[PDB]
Ligand binder design. Structure first.
Ligand code: DPV
Ligand code: DPV
Ligand code: DPV
Ligand code: DPV
Ligand code: DPV
Ligand code: DPV
Ligand code: DPV
Ligand code: DPV
Ligand code: DPV
Length: 10
């Protein structure tokens, strides 16, 4: 999901 994607980018 994009939520985990954003958390990974952070
Ligand atoms: C995490 C949901 C945020 C909802 C508010 C934002 C909506 C507009 C942008 C789209 C955000 C998508 O996000 P995600 O991680 O791929 O959603 C996956 C959701 N399910 C597991 C139910 C399929
Ligand atoms: C900020 C308040 C959030 C409330 C919780 C909302 C949870 C659901 C988020 C859903 C985000 C999009 O996910 P997705 O994988 O593209 O959806 C697959 C299904 N559709 C193609 C019909 C959108
Ligand atoms: C403050 C919160 C902000 C959250 C913002 C999240 C945005 C997530 C956007 C994810 C976009 C992923 O698009 P992609 O796979 O590269 O497709 C690009 C498609 N075209 C080639 C037709 C342009
Ligand atoms: C938060 C954003 C996540 C996006 C992730 C998916 C990227 C790939 C999108 C591929 C579909 C691009 O056509 P659309 O946008 O449906 O065309 C809308 C415009 N018309 C009605 C004129 C056709
Ligand atoms: C602006 C670009 C800066 C580049 C430099 C990065 C420096 C290192 C930052 C390391 C941040 C590590 O992530 P975190 O806070 O533990 O996880 C954020 C997501 N959760 C809270 C859900 C776990
Ligand atoms: C609704 C549309 C409005 C227009 C949005 C225009 C802004 C699009 C920004 C797209 C930026 C793409 O960065 P990327 O290659 O994934 O790098 C991620 C960052 N690091 C390399 C440091 C990890
Ligand atoms: C509430 C949870 C928040 C989690 C936030 C996690 C991300 C932390 C990011 C830490 C940022 C560190 O920036 P800095 O060392 O000055 O590098 C900036 C480098 N550029 C100028 C090239 C972009
Ligand atoms: C750089 C820091 C970015 C922080 C982004 C925070 C986004 C939060 C989105 C939350 C949307 C709602 O989701 P939910 O399933 O009802 O949440 C249940 C969990 N809480 C009770 C803690 C909300
Ligand atoms: C809820 C609001 C959250 C907002 C979070 C904003 C995050 C923005 C991340 C910005 C990441 C920038 O990385 P950077 O090393 O300069 O990129 C690579 C650039 N060079 C190729 C020139 C080295």
């Amino acid at each position: 999901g994009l939520l985990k994607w954003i958390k990974t980018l952070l």
